[PDB]
């Protein structure tokens, strides 16, 4: 039995701490995996004896007396957001995987400019699209209370050439009374959220 935890949020630039514990004290090998939402698990590094092991911004800590393995991610970036799995090999060749710990490295929004814009309608679509963008990483986007209104969770895009990151959530619906002024009414948006006419 190998035990991970669940969902974790770490500020951009801080150290992300991921730990797992195992039951078999006769374990000989310990591994960390990184897995994105679509891809398959990818081995990031491994450790066999007690101490720390650095491999760039990754650090693997092992204490076999206390029965824990750790993965430290220094100078964490939003691209580190994935599910991190801890695997432990017993006295034989059998690997016991953990449930995995989902990591979310939220970006630092230096100049938060929360606003809800209405994008230009598409002549090929019957939907009106609203964009809640440029809010800071502490704002949570709640699900849709209306049935035929669809709201996605917040997304982090990185304009690399401008060194600019921003959050954004999309809301759309084909109702005739759908307006962006109340598209995110079921969420706790900032009070200074800009609502252009």
């Amino acid at each position: 039995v190998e035990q991970n935890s669940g969902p974790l949020s770490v500020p951009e630039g801080a150290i992300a701490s991921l730990n797992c514990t195992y039951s078999d004290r006769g374990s000989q090998s310990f591994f960390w995996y990184r897995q994105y939402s679509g891809k398959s698990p990818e081995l990031i590094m491994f450790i066999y004896s007690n101490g720390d092991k650095e491999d760039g911004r990754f650090t693997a800590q092992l204490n076999k007396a206390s029965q824990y393995v750790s993965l430290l991610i220094r100078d964490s970036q939003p691209s580190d957001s994935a599910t991190y799995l801890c695997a432990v090999r017993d006295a034989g060749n059998m690997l016991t995987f953990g449930g995995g710990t989902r990591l979310m490295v939220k970006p630092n929004i230096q100049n938060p400019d929360p606003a809800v814009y209405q994008l230009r309608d598409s002549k090929s679509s019957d939907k009106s699209v609203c964009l809640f963008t440029d809010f800071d990483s502490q704002t949570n986007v709640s699900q849709s209370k209306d049935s035929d209104v669809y709201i996605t969770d917040k997304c982090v895009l990185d304009m690399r050439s401008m060194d600019f990151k921003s959050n954004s959530a999309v809301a759309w619906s084909n109702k005739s009374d759908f307006a962006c002024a109340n598209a995110f009414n079921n969420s706790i948006i900032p009070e200074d959220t800009f609502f252009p006419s």
Binding site: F31, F97, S122, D158, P196
Partner: protein, 246 residues
């Protein structure tokens, strides 16, 4: 350092049929395993493939349901027998243990995304639409955000990408990690998916720039029978595009 090749990549199969997926390694590795994992869930081991004998199945998985055959060290096949929609998952192949380069850790293959439907008539390709940036965002932030919606597709076998002036771009692009159900209570609900491309207002306001939202859909194959007035939902690319404007 072993290269694991899984086939097929993905497949849409009827309920009650059987699919034989395979896993081949370029080098001889001792241990070999078969995993099952749904997107977002945890990795659950099915069995450990033994060479020239029955595989050792974990609790819950039986041989009559998941026959596993490993002739040599570099080849193994898993058959999902009498498939039901509950067997829909991503089937992983993992190899590890002693090799010519020594005892290497377990690395995984690319997996086989298996979708099992009650009726293949429910396979629909996505409808893709691009929404041009808001003028209020352009004047307020000097940044223009395009939004792409892929809606009404089933199952969730889509791959969204943005293309600017014929070149696939990754900067300023964020797509939803997983599609959302259009009617979550319904078990046959079709999926929707959003994605944003954000550029500088001056780049969007250049009418020479071309913006295309490409959505690769993986559907039925040639051998899959199809008798409907609707166009056969084969593997296809559905796109929506927009030029710049000032």
């Amino acid at each position: 350092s072993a290269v694991i090749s899984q086939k097929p990549s993905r497949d849409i199969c009827q309920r009650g049929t059987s699919l034989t997926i395979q896993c081949q390694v370029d080098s001889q590795v001792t241990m070999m395993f078969w995993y099952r994992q749904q997107p977002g869930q945890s990795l659950t081991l099915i069995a450990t493939a033994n060479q020239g004998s029955e595989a050792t199945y974990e609790s819950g998985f039986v041989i009559d349901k998941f026959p596993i055959s490993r002739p040599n060290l570099t080849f193994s096949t898993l058959t999902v027998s009498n498939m039901s929609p509950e067997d829909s998952s991503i089937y992983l192949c993992s190899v590890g243990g002693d090799s010519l380069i020594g005892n290497q850790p377990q690395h995984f293959g690319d997996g086989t995304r298996l979708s099992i439907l009650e009726d293949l008539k429910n396979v629909f390709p996505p409808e893709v639409a691009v929404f041009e940036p808001s003028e209020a965002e352009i004047s307020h932030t000097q940044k223009a955000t395009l939004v792409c919606l892929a809606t009404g597709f089933y199952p969730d076998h889509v791959e969204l990408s943005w293309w600017v002036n014929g070149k696939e771009v990754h900067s300023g692009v964020c797509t939803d990690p997983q599609p959302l159900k259009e009617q979550p209570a319904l078990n046959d609900s079709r999926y929707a998916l959003s994605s944003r491309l954000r550029v500088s207002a001056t780049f969007w306001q250049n009418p020479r720039n071309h913006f295309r939202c490409q959505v690769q859909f993986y559907g039925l194959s040639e051998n899959d029978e199809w008798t409907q007035d609707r166009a056969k939902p084969v593997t296809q690319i559905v796109s929506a595009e927009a030029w710049g404007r000032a």
